[PDB]
Amino acid sequence: LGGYMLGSAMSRPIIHFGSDYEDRYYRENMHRYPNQVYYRPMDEYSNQNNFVHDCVNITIKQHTVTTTTKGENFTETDVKMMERVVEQMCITQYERESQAYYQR
C-alpha cells in the first residue's frame, strides 16, 4: 500500500452474471461485501473507467488482506464479483464529485 485511502459510502449496487450460481450467489452474500471503496482524491488521475480500475483493485485486495490477517482467503469468484460492485460504487462516487468538478 503506497498511499491510498477510502472513498464515500452508498447502497450496494447489483450486477448480474447470467448464471444462477453467480446471480444468486452474489445475492446470498452481498450482506458481507463492502459499501465503500479505496482510492486517492484527484492528484494524478482523471479518467472515468481507469480511475475506478486502480480504486477497485485496491478496495478488493484490501478485503482479501483483511481476511488473511484474520486467517481466511477469498477466491476468484468472490473477487470477480467485487470487481463489479466496487466499480459501480467507485463510478457512483466519481459522478457525485465530478458533478462538482464540472458545475463550477
Short mmCIF file of N, CA and C in Angstrom, two decimals:
data_model
loop_
_atom_site.label_atom_id
_atom_site.label_comp_id
_atom_site.label_asym_id
_atom_site.label_seq_id
_atom_site.Cartn_x
_atom_site.Cartn_y
_atom_site.Cartn_z
N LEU A 1 0.81 -1.22 0.00
CA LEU A 1 0.00 0.00 0.00
C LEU A 1 0.85 1.28 0.00
N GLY A 2 0.94 1.91 -1.17
CA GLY A 2 1.81 3.05 -1.42
C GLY A 2 1.22 4.40 -1.03
N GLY A 3 0.02 4.48 -0.46
CA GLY A 3 -0.61 5.73 -0.03
C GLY A 3 -1.95 5.93 -0.73
N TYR A 4 -2.89 5.01 -0.50
CA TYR A 4 -4.32 5.07 -0.79
C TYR A 4 -5.10 5.30 0.50
N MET A 5 -6.36 5.72 0.37
CA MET A 5 -7.32 5.94 1.44
C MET A 5 -8.69 5.45 0.95
N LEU A 6 -9.74 5.59 1.75
CA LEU A 6 -11.09 5.14 1.42
C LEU A 6 -11.76 6.13 0.45
N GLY A 7 -13.00 5.84 0.05
CA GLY A 7 -13.92 6.75 -0.60
C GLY A 7 -15.27 6.75 0.13
N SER A 8 -16.27 7.42 -0.43
CA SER A 8 -17.59 7.63 0.14
C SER A 8 -18.39 6.31 0.25
N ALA A 9 -19.60 6.39 0.81
CA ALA A 9 -20.48 5.24 1.07
C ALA A 9 -21.82 5.40 0.33
N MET A 10 -22.53 4.30 0.06
CA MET A 10 -23.84 4.30 -0.58
C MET A 10 -24.56 2.95 -0.38
N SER A 11 -25.66 2.71 -1.11
CA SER A 11 -26.32 1.42 -1.25
C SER A 11 -25.39 0.41 -1.95
N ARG A 12 -25.67 -0.90 -1.87
CA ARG A 12 -24.85 -1.93 -2.54
C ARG A 12 -25.34 -2.11 -3.99
N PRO A 13 -24.59 -1.69 -5.02
CA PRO A 13 -25.04 -1.81 -6.41
C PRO A 13 -25.04 -3.28 -6.84
N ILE A 14 -26.01 -3.65 -7.68
CA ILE A 14 -26.26 -5.02 -8.10
C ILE A 14 -25.86 -5.20 -9.55
N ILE A 15 -25.26 -6.35 -9.84
CA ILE A 15 -24.74 -6.70 -11.14
C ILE A 15 -24.95 -8.21 -11.33
N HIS A 16 -25.73 -8.59 -12.35
CA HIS A 16 -25.92 -9.98 -12.75
C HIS A 16 -24.67 -10.51 -13.48
N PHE A 17 -24.66 -11.82 -13.72
CA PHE A 17 -23.65 -12.53 -14.47
C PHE A 17 -24.28 -13.54 -15.43
N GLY A 18 -25.60 -13.75 -15.38
CA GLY A 18 -26.33 -14.60 -16.29
C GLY A 18 -26.41 -16.05 -15.82
N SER A 19 -25.79 -16.42 -14.70
CA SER A 19 -25.80 -17.80 -14.20
C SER A 19 -26.34 -17.81 -12.77
N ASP A 20 -27.14 -18.82 -12.40
CA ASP A 20 -27.76 -18.91 -11.06
C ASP A 20 -26.68 -18.79 -10.00
N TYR A 21 -25.63 -19.61 -10.11
CA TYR A 21 -24.57 -19.67 -9.12
C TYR A 21 -23.74 -18.39 -9.02
N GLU A 22 -24.02 -17.36 -9.81
CA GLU A 22 -23.36 -16.06 -9.72
C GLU A 22 -24.37 -14.94 -9.44
N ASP A 23 -25.59 -15.08 -9.94
CA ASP A 23 -26.69 -14.11 -9.86
C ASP A 23 -27.29 -14.20 -8.46
N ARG A 24 -27.52 -15.43 -8.02
CA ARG A 24 -28.00 -15.78 -6.70
C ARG A 24 -26.83 -15.69 -5.74
N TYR A 25 -25.66 -16.23 -6.09
CA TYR A 25 -24.61 -16.37 -5.07
C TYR A 25 -24.16 -15.00 -4.55
N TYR A 26 -23.92 -14.03 -5.44
CA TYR A 26 -23.64 -12.67 -5.01
C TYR A 26 -24.75 -12.18 -4.07
N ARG A 27 -26.01 -12.45 -4.39
CA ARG A 27 -27.17 -12.05 -3.61
C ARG A 27 -27.26 -12.58 -2.21
N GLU A 28 -26.98 -13.85 -2.05
CA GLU A 28 -26.89 -14.50 -0.75
C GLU A 28 -25.92 -13.71 0.11
N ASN A 29 -24.80 -13.30 -0.49
CA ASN A 29 -23.63 -12.92 0.31
C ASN A 29 -23.21 -11.47 0.10
N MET A 30 -24.07 -10.65 -0.52
CA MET A 30 -23.84 -9.22 -0.67
C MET A 30 -23.91 -8.54 0.69
N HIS A 31 -24.61 -9.16 1.64
CA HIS A 31 -24.66 -8.74 3.03
C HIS A 31 -23.30 -8.79 3.74
N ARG A 32 -22.25 -9.39 3.14
CA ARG A 32 -20.87 -9.39 3.65
C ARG A 32 -19.89 -8.64 2.74
N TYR A 33 -20.33 -8.13 1.59
CA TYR A 33 -19.49 -7.35 0.69
C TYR A 33 -19.29 -5.92 1.23
N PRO A 34 -18.38 -5.11 0.66
CA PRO A 34 -18.19 -3.70 1.03
C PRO A 34 -19.41 -2.83 0.71
N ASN A 35 -19.33 -1.58 1.16
CA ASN A 35 -20.24 -0.46 0.90
C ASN A 35 -19.48 0.84 0.64
N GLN A 36 -18.15 0.85 0.82
CA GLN A 36 -17.29 1.97 0.44
C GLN A 36 -16.17 1.42 -0.43
N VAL A 37 -15.33 2.31 -0.94
CA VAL A 37 -14.25 1.95 -1.86
C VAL A 37 -12.90 2.44 -1.32
N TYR A 38 -11.80 2.20 -2.03
CA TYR A 38 -10.47 2.72 -1.76
C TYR A 38 -9.95 3.45 -2.99
N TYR A 39 -9.43 4.67 -2.87
CA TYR A 39 -8.85 5.45 -3.96
C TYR A 39 -7.92 6.53 -3.37
N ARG A 40 -7.45 7.51 -4.15
CA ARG A 40 -6.88 8.77 -3.67
C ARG A 40 -7.69 9.89 -4.32
N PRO A 41 -7.95 11.02 -3.65
CA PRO A 41 -8.67 12.10 -4.31
C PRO A 41 -7.79 12.68 -5.42
N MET A 42 -8.41 13.25 -6.46
CA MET A 42 -7.76 13.58 -7.74
C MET A 42 -6.44 14.31 -7.53
N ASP A 43 -5.33 13.61 -7.68
CA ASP A 43 -3.98 14.15 -7.54
C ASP A 43 -3.12 13.82 -8.76
N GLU A 44 -3.55 12.88 -9.60
CA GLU A 44 -2.65 12.22 -10.56
C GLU A 44 -3.40 11.50 -11.68
N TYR A 45 -4.72 11.32 -11.55
CA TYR A 45 -5.55 10.57 -12.48
C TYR A 45 -6.93 11.23 -12.59
N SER A 46 -7.60 11.05 -13.74
CA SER A 46 -8.81 11.80 -14.11
C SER A 46 -9.60 11.12 -15.25
N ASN A 47 -9.28 9.87 -15.61
CA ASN A 47 -10.20 9.04 -16.41
C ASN A 47 -11.45 8.74 -15.58
N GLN A 48 -12.50 8.20 -16.21
CA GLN A 48 -13.70 7.72 -15.52
C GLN A 48 -13.49 6.25 -15.15
N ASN A 49 -13.20 5.42 -16.15
CA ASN A 49 -13.02 3.99 -16.05
C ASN A 49 -11.76 3.65 -15.27
N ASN A 50 -10.63 4.22 -15.68
CA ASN A 50 -9.33 3.77 -15.18
C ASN A 50 -9.04 4.28 -13.77
N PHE A 51 -9.58 5.45 -13.42
CA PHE A 51 -9.69 5.96 -12.05
C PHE A 51 -10.34 4.92 -11.14
N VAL A 52 -11.29 4.16 -11.67
CA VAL A 52 -12.01 3.16 -10.90
C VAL A 52 -11.23 1.85 -10.91
N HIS A 53 -10.44 1.58 -11.95
CA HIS A 53 -9.66 0.36 -12.07
C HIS A 53 -8.74 0.19 -10.86
N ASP A 54 -7.89 1.20 -10.64
CA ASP A 54 -6.94 1.32 -9.53
C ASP A 54 -7.68 1.14 -8.21
N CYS A 55 -8.72 1.96 -8.01
CA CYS A 55 -9.51 2.03 -6.79
C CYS A 55 -10.08 0.66 -6.44
N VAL A 56 -10.76 0.06 -7.41
CA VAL A 56 -11.38 -1.22 -7.25
C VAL A 56 -10.32 -2.24 -6.87
N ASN A 57 -9.23 -2.35 -7.63
CA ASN A 57 -8.19 -3.36 -7.41
C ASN A 57 -7.69 -3.32 -5.96
N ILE A 58 -7.58 -2.11 -5.42
CA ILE A 58 -7.18 -1.82 -4.06
C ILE A 58 -8.28 -2.24 -3.08
N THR A 59 -9.49 -1.65 -3.11
CA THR A 59 -10.58 -1.97 -2.15
C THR A 59 -10.80 -3.48 -2.08
N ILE A 60 -10.84 -4.08 -3.26
CA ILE A 60 -10.90 -5.54 -3.40
C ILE A 60 -9.77 -6.21 -2.64
N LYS A 61 -8.52 -5.97 -3.05
CA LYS A 61 -7.38 -6.63 -2.45
C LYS A 61 -7.42 -6.45 -0.94
N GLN A 62 -7.83 -5.28 -0.47
CA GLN A 62 -7.90 -4.94 0.94
C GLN A 62 -8.85 -5.87 1.69
N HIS A 63 -9.98 -6.28 1.09
CA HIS A 63 -10.83 -7.30 1.70
C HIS A 63 -10.09 -8.64 1.79
N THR A 64 -9.30 -9.00 0.78
CA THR A 64 -8.51 -10.22 0.80
C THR A 64 -7.48 -10.17 1.93
N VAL A 65 -6.71 -9.08 2.04
CA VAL A 65 -5.75 -8.87 3.11
C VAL A 65 -6.47 -8.96 4.45
N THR A 66 -7.59 -8.26 4.61
CA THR A 66 -8.32 -8.25 5.88
C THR A 66 -8.71 -9.70 6.23
N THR A 67 -9.19 -10.52 5.29
CA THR A 67 -9.46 -11.92 5.62
C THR A 67 -8.18 -12.64 6.04
N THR A 68 -7.08 -12.48 5.30
CA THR A 68 -5.84 -13.18 5.60
C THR A 68 -5.24 -12.77 6.94
N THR A 69 -5.38 -11.51 7.35
CA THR A 69 -4.83 -11.02 8.60
C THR A 69 -5.63 -11.58 9.79
N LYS A 70 -6.82 -12.15 9.53
CA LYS A 70 -7.67 -12.84 10.49
C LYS A 70 -7.35 -14.33 10.44
N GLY A 71 -7.31 -14.91 9.24
CA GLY A 71 -6.94 -16.29 8.96
C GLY A 71 -7.87 -16.92 7.93
N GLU A 72 -8.22 -16.20 6.86
CA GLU A 72 -9.11 -16.68 5.78
C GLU A 72 -8.59 -16.15 4.44
N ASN A 73 -9.04 -16.72 3.31
CA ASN A 73 -8.71 -16.23 1.97
C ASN A 73 -9.89 -16.42 1.03
N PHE A 74 -10.31 -15.33 0.40
CA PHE A 74 -11.34 -15.31 -0.65
C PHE A 74 -10.88 -16.07 -1.91
N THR A 75 -11.71 -16.07 -2.94
CA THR A 75 -11.49 -16.79 -4.19
C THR A 75 -11.66 -15.85 -5.37
N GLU A 76 -11.29 -16.32 -6.56
CA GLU A 76 -11.52 -15.62 -7.82
C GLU A 76 -13.00 -15.27 -7.96
N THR A 77 -13.90 -16.16 -7.51
CA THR A 77 -15.33 -15.92 -7.54
C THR A 77 -15.67 -14.65 -6.76
N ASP A 78 -15.31 -14.61 -5.47
CA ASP A 78 -15.64 -13.52 -4.57
C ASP A 78 -14.93 -12.21 -4.97
N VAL A 79 -13.94 -12.29 -5.86
CA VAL A 79 -13.09 -11.19 -6.29
C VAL A 79 -13.67 -10.60 -7.57
N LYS A 80 -13.96 -11.43 -8.58
CA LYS A 80 -14.67 -11.03 -9.80
C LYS A 80 -15.98 -10.33 -9.45
N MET A 81 -16.70 -10.87 -8.48
CA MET A 81 -17.96 -10.30 -8.04
C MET A 81 -17.76 -8.92 -7.42
N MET A 82 -16.68 -8.71 -6.66
CA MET A 82 -16.37 -7.38 -6.18
C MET A 82 -15.92 -6.45 -7.31
N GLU A 83 -15.24 -6.92 -8.36
CA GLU A 83 -14.81 -6.06 -9.47
C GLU A 83 -15.98 -5.31 -10.08
N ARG A 84 -17.15 -5.94 -10.11
CA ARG A 84 -18.42 -5.33 -10.47
C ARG A 84 -18.89 -4.31 -9.43
N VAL A 85 -19.08 -4.74 -8.19
CA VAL A 85 -19.78 -3.97 -7.18
C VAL A 85 -18.95 -2.75 -6.75
N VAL A 86 -17.66 -2.95 -6.45
CA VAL A 86 -16.75 -1.88 -6.05
C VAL A 86 -16.64 -0.89 -7.22
N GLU A 87 -16.67 -1.35 -8.48
CA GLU A 87 -16.60 -0.47 -9.64
C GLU A 87 -17.77 0.46 -9.62
N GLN A 88 -18.97 -0.09 -9.64
CA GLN A 88 -20.18 0.71 -9.57
C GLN A 88 -20.15 1.69 -8.41
N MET A 89 -19.68 1.31 -7.22
CA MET A 89 -19.52 2.28 -6.13
C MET A 89 -18.46 3.34 -6.47
N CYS A 90 -17.36 2.99 -7.15
CA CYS A 90 -16.29 3.92 -7.42
C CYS A 90 -16.74 4.90 -8.53
N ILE A 91 -17.52 4.44 -9.52
CA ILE A 91 -18.13 5.30 -10.54
C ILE A 91 -19.17 6.19 -9.87
N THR A 92 -20.02 5.63 -9.01
CA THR A 92 -21.08 6.41 -8.40
C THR A 92 -20.51 7.49 -7.47
N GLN A 93 -19.35 7.30 -6.83
CA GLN A 93 -18.70 8.40 -6.13
C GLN A 93 -18.03 9.37 -7.12
N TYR A 94 -17.39 8.86 -8.18
CA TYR A 94 -16.76 9.68 -9.22
C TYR A 94 -17.79 10.66 -9.77
N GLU A 95 -18.96 10.19 -10.19
CA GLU A 95 -20.08 11.00 -10.66
C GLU A 95 -20.43 12.08 -9.64
N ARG A 96 -20.61 11.68 -8.38
CA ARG A 96 -21.08 12.55 -7.30
C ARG A 96 -20.05 13.60 -6.88
N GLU A 97 -18.84 13.58 -7.43
CA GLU A 97 -17.83 14.61 -7.21
C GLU A 97 -17.39 15.29 -8.51
N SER A 98 -17.34 14.56 -9.62
CA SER A 98 -17.10 15.09 -10.95
C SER A 98 -18.28 15.97 -11.38
N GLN A 99 -19.49 15.78 -10.81
CA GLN A 99 -20.57 16.75 -10.93
C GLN A 99 -20.08 18.13 -10.48
N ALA A 100 -19.43 18.20 -9.31
CA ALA A 100 -18.99 19.45 -8.73
C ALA A 100 -17.65 19.94 -9.29
N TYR A 101 -16.83 19.05 -9.84
CA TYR A 101 -15.64 19.41 -10.60
C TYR A 101 -16.05 20.14 -11.90
N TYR A 102 -17.19 19.75 -12.49
CA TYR A 102 -17.73 20.35 -13.70
C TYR A 102 -18.51 21.62 -13.39
N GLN A 103 -19.56 21.54 -12.56
CA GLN A 103 -20.63 22.53 -12.45
C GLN A 103 -20.16 23.90 -11.99
N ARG A 104 -18.95 24.00 -11.43
CA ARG A 104 -18.29 25.26 -11.07
C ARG A 104 -17.88 26.09 -12.29
#
